[PDB]
Write an enzyme that holds these catalytic residues in place. Sequence first.
Site, PDB file in Angstrom:
ATOM      1  N   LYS A   1       1.365  -6.882   1.136  1.00  0.00           N
ATOM      2  CA  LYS A   1       0.711  -8.068   0.609  1.00  0.00           C
ATOM      3  C   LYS A   1       1.778  -9.152   0.611  1.00  0.00           C
TER       4      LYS A   1
ATOM      5  N   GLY B   1      -6.707  -8.438   5.492  1.00  0.00           N
ATOM      6  CA  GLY B   1      -7.412  -9.434   4.707  1.00  0.00           C
ATOM      7  C   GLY B   1      -6.523 -10.619   4.376  1.00  0.00           C
TER       8      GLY B   1
ATOM      9  N   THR C   1      -6.422 -14.098   1.725  1.00  0.00           N
ATOM     10  CA  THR C   1      -6.935 -14.902   0.630  1.00  0.00           C
ATOM     11  C   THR C   1      -5.887 -15.956   0.298  1.00  0.00           C
ATOM     12  N   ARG C   2      -6.266 -16.912  -0.552  1.00  0.00           N
ATOM     13  CA  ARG C   2      -5.298 -17.917  -0.973  1.00  0.00           C
ATOM     14  C   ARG C   2      -4.146 -17.299  -1.753  1.00  0.00           C
ATOM     15  N   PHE C   3      -4.399 -16.205  -2.476  1.00  0.00           N
ATOM     16  CA  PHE C   3      -3.348 -15.588  -3.275  1.00  0.00           C
ATOM     17  C   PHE C   3      -2.490 -14.614  -2.471  1.00  0.00           C
ATOM     18  N   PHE C   4      -3.106 -13.574  -1.900  1.00  0.00           N
ATOM     19  CA  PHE C   4      -2.375 -12.581  -1.122  1.00  0.00           C
ATOM     20  C   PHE C   4      -3.018 -12.305   0.229  1.00  0.00           C
ATOM     21  N   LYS C   5      -2.179 -12.231   1.261  1.00  0.00           N
ATOM     22  CA  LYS C   5      -2.584 -11.829   2.602  1.00  0.00           C
ATOM     23  C   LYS C   5      -2.106 -10.393   2.791  1.00  0.00           C
ATOM     24  N   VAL C   6      -3.035  -9.485   3.077  1.00  0.00           N
ATOM     25  CA  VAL C   6      -2.753  -8.056   3.168  1.00  0.00           C
ATOM     26  C   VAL C   6      -2.882  -7.614   4.619  1.00  0.00           C
TER      27      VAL C   6
ATOM     28  N   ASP D   1      -6.606  -5.077 -12.811  1.00  0.00           N
ATOM     29  CA  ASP D   1      -7.432  -5.441 -11.661  1.00  0.00           C
ATOM     30  C   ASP D   1      -8.095  -4.169 -11.138  1.00  0.00           C
TER      31      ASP D   1
HETATM   32  N1  GTP Z   1      -8.843   1.897   4.454  1.00  0.00           N
HETATM   33  C1  GTP Z   1      -7.919   1.229   3.775  1.00  0.00           C
HETATM   34  N2  GTP Z   1      -8.250   0.061   3.134  1.00  0.00           N
HETATM   35  C2  GTP Z   1      -7.305  -0.618   2.444  1.00  0.00           C
HETATM   36  C3  GTP Z   1      -6.003  -0.152   2.374  1.00  0.00           C
HETATM   37  N3  GTP Z   1      -5.292  -1.026   1.631  1.00  0.00           N
HETATM   38  C4  GTP Z   1      -6.110  -2.019   1.221  1.00  0.00           C
HETATM   39  N4  GTP Z   1      -7.352  -1.786   1.737  1.00  0.00           N
HETATM   40  C5  GTP Z   1      -8.542  -2.623   1.541  1.00  0.00           C
HETATM   41  O1  GTP Z   1      -8.431  -3.892   2.144  1.00  0.00           O
HETATM   42  C6  GTP Z   1      -8.703  -4.894   1.183  1.00  0.00           C
HETATM   43  C7  GTP Z   1      -7.402  -5.520   0.665  1.00  0.00           C
HETATM   44  O2  GTP Z   1      -7.597  -6.398  -0.429  1.00  0.00           O
HETATM   45  P1  GTP Z   1      -7.108  -6.164  -1.952  1.00  0.00           P
HETATM   46  O3  GTP Z   1      -6.149  -7.262  -2.328  1.00  0.00           O
HETATM   47  O4  GTP Z   1      -6.448  -4.818  -2.121  1.00  0.00           O
HETATM   48  O5  GTP Z   1      -8.472  -6.299  -2.803  1.00  0.00           O
HETATM   49  P2  GTP Z   1      -8.628  -5.944  -4.366  1.00  0.00           P
HETATM   50  O6  GTP Z   1      -8.331  -4.486  -4.588  1.00  0.00           O
HETATM   51  O7  GTP Z   1     -10.001  -6.297  -4.859  1.00  0.00           O
HETATM   52  O8  GTP Z   1      -7.548  -6.862  -5.129  1.00  0.00           O
HETATM   53  P3  GTP Z   1      -6.335  -6.274  -6.008  1.00  0.00           P
HETATM   54  O9  GTP Z   1      -6.862  -5.862  -7.362  1.00  0.00           O
HETATM   55  O10 GTP Z   1      -5.323  -7.359  -6.249  1.00  0.00           O
HETATM   56  O11 GTP Z   1      -5.673  -5.126  -5.280  1.00  0.00           O
HETATM   57  C8  GTP Z   1      -9.507  -4.167   0.120  1.00  0.00           C
HETATM   58  O12 GTP Z   1     -10.827  -3.978   0.556  1.00  0.00           O
HETATM   59  C9  GTP Z   1      -8.805  -2.838   0.075  1.00  0.00           C
HETATM   60  O13 GTP Z   1      -9.709  -1.846  -0.349  1.00  0.00           O
HETATM   61  C10 GTP Z   1      -5.665   1.026   3.020  1.00  0.00           C
HETATM   62  O14 GTP Z   1      -4.518   1.460   2.975  1.00  0.00           O
HETATM   63  N5  GTP Z   1      -6.629   1.709   3.719  1.00  0.00           N
END
Ligand code: GTP
EC number: 2.7.11.1
Lengths: 134, 66, 122
Positions: free
Chosen positions: A38, A18, A20-25, A133
């Site tokens: 991230k 994923g 976003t402007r804040f974090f790229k995961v 969060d």
């Molecule tokens: N299946 C799977 N999904 C993941 C994993 N890590 C993150 N994700 C998903 O990929 C997306 C990553 O964005 P996030 O920044 O974690 O979204 P968020 O939880 O609403 O934001 P934060 O509260 O900052 O963590 C989200 O849908 C997470 O559920 C993982 O290890 N396995």
Amino acid sequence: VESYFSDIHDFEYDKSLGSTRFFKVARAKHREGLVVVKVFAIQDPTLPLTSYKQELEELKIRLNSAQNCLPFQKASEKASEKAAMLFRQYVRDNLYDRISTRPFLNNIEKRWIAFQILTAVDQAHKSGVRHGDI
Amino acid sequence: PDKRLEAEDYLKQQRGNAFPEIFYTFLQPYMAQFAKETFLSADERILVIRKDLGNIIHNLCGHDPK
Amino acid sequence: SLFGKYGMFRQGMHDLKVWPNVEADGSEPTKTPGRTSSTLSEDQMSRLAKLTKAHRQGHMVKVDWLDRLTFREIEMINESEKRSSNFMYLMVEFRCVKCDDKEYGIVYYEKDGDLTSFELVK
Ligand SMILES: Nc1nc2c(ncn2[C@@H]2O[C@H](COP(=O)(O)OP(=O)(O)OP(=O)(O)O)[C@@H](O)[C@H]2O)c(=O)[nH]1
């Protein structure tokens, strides 16, 4: 996001999770297994990222003993001159995906998932960590 | 915020209602062994479950919603 | 048992004690064991039978003068035991494997027979 992994030899880029402007995961492979990274792109180097890194290290120490709590295990201030990166263990599924992936969670599994969420919050509060969060 | 309880209170309030007692007494303590830092390989996990099978059935089914 | 106490498949001729009036039992442990292990009451006949065979194969030191007397003593013991223990003994022999004139032993082994702390993986 994958371009940021070219500078981390212990992590091999696998997939993007994923942007976003804040974090790229993104997911990467490490000697310990799969990890979620991230990446926060440092646009202004004058930002006090050291203060945030210290806060993250405090979170790691406070949450190290929680069984249902997964703090950021690694925080790199200058991983690259362009971005600071946070590292944590990869979990098979996020709750958002788990709901739509078979086998569909039964009533007993739904109760169990809810129970563990509450236990995670209880443990975090006693450990001095607040999520912010959830 | 003044209406939100502490996490421990919700678990106690719903203990036996939304969460069956089996979750606290056995599921949480037993399952915690598998989420520990000490890695149990898939082979080891099966042997551990096999060894405990008799205890698991006694703890989950009783002698008999089980 | 097809595998010995050390996992080696049985070889040579083996005399198995036949339990009268009962079908051969396959449960583990068998109720009609053929090879009475050393943990139970050592049957002087069974111990001497093993010794006579160990002698035949050349695994015991041959003392000509002792043998004539000792084997004559064994004959008396076996004759006396045959009169009081009317048990039948069924002989079974297992095949032996040879390659380039060398004997090979089959040992029980599984086809797939050949990190506890993680820094990141919790
Ligand atoms: N299946 C799977 N999904 C993941 C994993 N890590 C993150 N994700 C998903 O990929 C997306 C990553 O964005 P996030 O920044 O974690 O979204 P968020 O939880 O609403 O934001 P934060 O509260 O900052 O963590 C989200 O849908 C997470 O559920 C993982 O290890 N396995």
